[PDB]
Write an enzyme that holds these catalytic residues in place. Structure first.
Site, PDB file in Angstrom:
ATOM      1  N   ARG A 114     -24.618   1.807   0.306  1.00 53.62           N
ATOM      2  CA  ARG A 114     -24.737   0.380   0.076  1.00 53.62           C
ATOM      3  C   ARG A 114     -25.372  -0.282   1.304  1.00 53.62           C
ATOM      4  NH1 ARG A 114     -20.414  -0.369  -4.834  1.00 53.62           N
ATOM      5  NH2 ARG A 114     -18.518  -0.196  -3.695  1.00 53.62           N
TER       6      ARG A 114
ATOM      7  N   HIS B  45     -12.189   4.264   4.746  1.00 52.00           N
ATOM      8  CA  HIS B  45     -12.859   3.661   3.611  1.00 52.00           C
ATOM      9  C   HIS B  45     -12.328   2.298   3.305  1.00 52.00           C
ATOM     10  CE1 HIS B  45     -13.342   3.262  -1.021  1.00 52.00           C
ATOM     11  NE2 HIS B  45     -14.312   2.667  -0.348  1.00 52.00           N
TER      12      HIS B  45
ATOM     13  N   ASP C  57     -20.375   3.490   0.398  1.00 55.84           N
ATOM     14  CA  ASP C  57     -20.467   2.405   1.369  1.00 55.84           C
ATOM     15  C   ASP C  57     -21.739   2.489   2.246  1.00 55.84           C
ATOM     16  OD1 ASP C  57     -17.971   1.164   0.788  1.00 55.84           O
ATOM     17  OD2 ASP C  57     -17.046   2.688   2.142  1.00 55.84           O
TER      18      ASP C  57
ATOM     19  N   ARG D 166       0.855  -1.211   0.000  1.00 54.60           N
ATOM     20  CA  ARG D 166       0.000   0.000   0.000  1.00 54.60           C
ATOM     21  C   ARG D 166       0.884   1.253   0.000  1.00 54.60           C
ATOM     22  NH1 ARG D 166      -3.648   2.131   4.377  1.00 54.60           N
ATOM     23  NH2 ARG D 166      -3.381   0.015   5.306  1.00 54.60           N
TER      24      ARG D 166
END
Lengths: 329, 329, 329, 329
Positions: free
Chosen positions: A169, A193, A166, A106
């Protein structure tokens, strides 16, 4: 002796053309075209400028979009490889990024994006001194910090897509399970997130009725927790099935642009500067319920989280602050 | 002793669920997803069903779209490989077809599409006895005839995308050249969709002022005719640049669906049965200005073409009737 | 230790309140309330200020309107006897006037209105330097000239309701007779608003088809001319039946405000300065097809009238110029 | 040899005219015209029929409204003294009633309205077997029961304006005091519409934050209770100032019609049959939070009131049941 001259006359008085609710989108990928057509279809801007590095693809995207002019209410559509095309935007949506590779860390992925953003964002602010920036690009909380840092914008004019979709959702899944429309169900996914997103179980409600008081409760065991897992999963499901994401996200962003553009002061879980909020001490962006208006983030909604929760929030802030070892490799 | 049971009660009286302005899209390609998101964004249907043969891609498209529920006003989104999922549609948009190959003859290409359509359309009508069909698939005038022929629908419930988008493009180009919005400029491209599209020069106007009377005229030589050439060209330009078309077309179709769904009786240049209209004697579909309502084609606007024009129209009808040597190879 | 202080926190940064698409209505009579509720219902302004001399009636009108806030999208509603309440308007609609008495001469009636307007309009411009004024008040062509003259505004920022509603009525009647919606029928009533309104027979059309070429024609005898007579009559019919006019007019004005506010450049038959247009030599306002944008009258559509027509136009200009013997009695 | 015949041709096939989302308004008073223009301005119906006993006033109201056709999206406007004009309505709004006199007892006033309603409502149901009725007329809770009783409609197809507007007013006042839009503030006034309206203090909130937990509380003493008093007062204030109410109410009703017409299942505090709900034993209508769909009242939201509250609710039910000594004088 021109058709144009034979047919269109003039008042003695006039004023240099003009565009006041200009929006620019960066990237004509799947997220970018999806963001651009939902903004259009929404009548949020009297000008839309599309900016990408890929010449061909840009012109062609531009054209497709222009040919449909008769069906819209946006007067001027434009595209540029050059940033001066975005000169005068109210709002900038960034959807340009690298996608993370075979054996990429990452840290290395964010570093990759840092070197792309160095060319993007500096140019935006120079052509658009008064813009607010909306970062969609993933990882969003880190790319938001980068955009913040790279531009020199007051922290309030820098927003991250963050945890909006999100939540969108989560509310969906509730609604399917409950039998009410997603807009009548209310719950919040905040934090960093992704896999590390905190679901505020205790804010969950319908009509004003707290699910928590009725189910005897729930957070720990008896299938409901599930609801959070396929919010983040079902997102990988999509990819695995379709090969990418666009419609839901685009839609999400238009939702953010309407609030911003129409100065609504509506509450959105978007990525903000959360320094010295829930014991977080450094320069880390994460999702919180923010009121938005035309100058970006107007306020923050101070949740009352449990430690269990804020602990988790803190774990994100550290983890992100760690990546922030940026500027090369 | 269920969250759901603790929270949602019941009136003693109720009625089996329901959907009344159902629309179904066939194909989740670029045209299909573009048609499906513009219909959605438009609030034309209280149900949208997506039908394709590609399992994965379908489910994933379905999902993307569902996740954005909170941002829309369409209650029910669904997808199926099976046609019974489309059971009860007001309108069906078909965007499934083959794309024409290396050394493929227009006869062999239409033949290819005939064998796909044999599986599509028969099933639609059996599940949707009262639907109207909207053919987008290219070649559109031939695929419209096929759909007509394959279904057994009154000729008025069978429409072809035909020359709508082309006109939308013509009006665009006028507007750019004239300096007025595309919706204030009026001109008509009718006939056989494509290279063989007739531009009614003599209907061209702004405000009600006939361009033809003012430019001294124009049809034959002094750069204006150009306007028709890159209407059909600039369409190949797009492809060459982007690798496909979607936004303009989708938009185009929503435009057609709104008229149809809202029973508007608005005038559209769409592909219709033009038999014994301008001396055409056989069963050929081509573009004419039609009024549309909820039962499909309500009427035809009888243009007064020149022979020059109608001759051309006739040349299409023959050429198409010739292909109509279908049912195999 | 205030509910408000316990519940609403603050960002360190903020900016003095604001209103950018402010509109003000003068008069809370029937036309005024009708104009104010159609603007509201239309979301044309982020602020609406109501100005009348009648204290009570104003406050109460204000209140009625405010109580419905939840149902609207206009943030701020206000009323004032004082003109500083209108400070900062984009657009001003004037609907205040005297109504003409028992034995009143059109000269004495306009003189009456001149002495009311002396108190209205000067104050508007001082509080709203950048406003455009929309005169509804009858007689409109004369009251427009007065407002023009009393304010000191560029002639383009001064518009009269003029012949818009009349045309709206003409198109209605056509549609009833033809069987198509009023928005598909096109005809124009221009000139001096009222009994002296010229009906451009030769511009009448549907789809682009000139009624005149088809009916063999018509202007002189075989019942169609009728259409113009009860456009001006049926307006007295209303009064005789209801005791006043409001809904149609209000609606008419919102139509004008949308164009203006959204910078549409749509064509409206409104009252303008028509000096040295059709041989008119003095300072007289009458109706012509004008393009409107946010700075008021952008352009004029130069009709090609017959002498028969322009003669009539001229007769109005003289007749009006004659009244213009104003400033007292 | 008719203009109409020369210009409009025909398909060989067609179907008898039609109207599917028909709404009828009874009474062309101030509430009636206000309800009718907000429905219109909202595009809720493809037909609007206006019914009153006053010939002249009706025709004139009808006309005013028709003249504005070009500005609307409702195809057919009609008026009748006869009830067969309302034949086929989805929804009926009743705004006809007597206004209570010098020395009139609530019993005598309701009795007065009973004898008017005997002529109204029976006729509606005979011409509109499938309609739902919306009672605006005051006293609303009693007039709703009467309409229920007079028609023979399932109890779910009979709704009273009830406490909607009052709540709309409460939310307004909160918002002014709090600084947030009325649609972000949530509180509920339920019970018997009027002076006897119960304010659910404990449901009051912003964002999901209960005012009650923060203000230390409040219901009993420290100026907030005030908020309920001028909700019912400020309503008399209006009258005293303007001489009547219209805009807020009309708006209120369109809000109810949209929910109903678009099958939204939105929650409204409207007057319903509240028998054996909170220990109420007889046939009395009062306000409760109801979900609405196209068949009227779909469900009831079961509040958890305090006894203090439900006691009050009970006092209304008794008081109303007492009036229900109707059928003459």
């Amino acid at each position: 002796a021109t058709l144009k001259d034979k047919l269109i006359g003039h008042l003695a008085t006039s004023q240099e053309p003009r565009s006041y609710n200009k929006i620019t989108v960066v990237g004509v990928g799947a997220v970018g075209m999806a963001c651009a057509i939902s903004i259009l279809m929404k009548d949020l801007a009297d000008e839309v400028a599309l900016v990408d590095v890929m010449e061909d693809k840009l012109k062609g995207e531009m054209m497709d979009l222009q040919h449909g002019s008769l069906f819209l209410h946006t007067a001027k559509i434009v595209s540029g490889k050059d940033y001066s095309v975005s000169a005068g935007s109210k709002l900038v949506v960034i959807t340009a990024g690298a996608r993370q590779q075979e054996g990429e860390s990452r840290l290395n992925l964010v570093q990759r994006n840092v070197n792309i953003f160095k060319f993007i964002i500096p140019n935006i602010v120079k052509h658009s001194p008064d813009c607010i920036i909306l970062v969609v690009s993933n990882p969003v909380d880190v790319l938001t910090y980068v955009a913040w840092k790279l531009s020199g914008l007051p922290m309030h004019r820098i927003i991250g897509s963050g945890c909006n979709l999100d939540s969108a959702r989560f509310r969906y899944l509730m609604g399917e399970r409950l039998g009410v429309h997603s807009c009548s169900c209310h719950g919040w996914v905040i934090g960093e997130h992704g896999d590390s997103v905190p679901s505020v179980w205790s804010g969950m409600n319908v009509a004003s009725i707290k699910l928590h008081p009725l189910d005897g409760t729930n957070k720990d065991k008896q299938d409901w927790k599930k609801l959070h897992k396929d919010v983040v999963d079902s997102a990988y499901e999509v990819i695995k099935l379709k090969g990418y994401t666009s419609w839901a996200i685009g839609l999400s962003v238009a939702d953010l642009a309407e609030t911003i553009m129409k100065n609504l002061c509506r509450v959105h879980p978007v990525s903000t500067m959360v320094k010295d909020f829930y014991g977080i001490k450094d320069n880390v962006f994460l999702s919180l319920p923010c009121v938005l208006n035309d100058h970006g983030i107007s306020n923050i909604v101070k949740m009352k989280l449990k430690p269990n929760e804020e602990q988790q929030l803190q774990k994100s802030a550290t983890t992100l602050w760690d990546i922030q070892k940026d500027l090369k490799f």
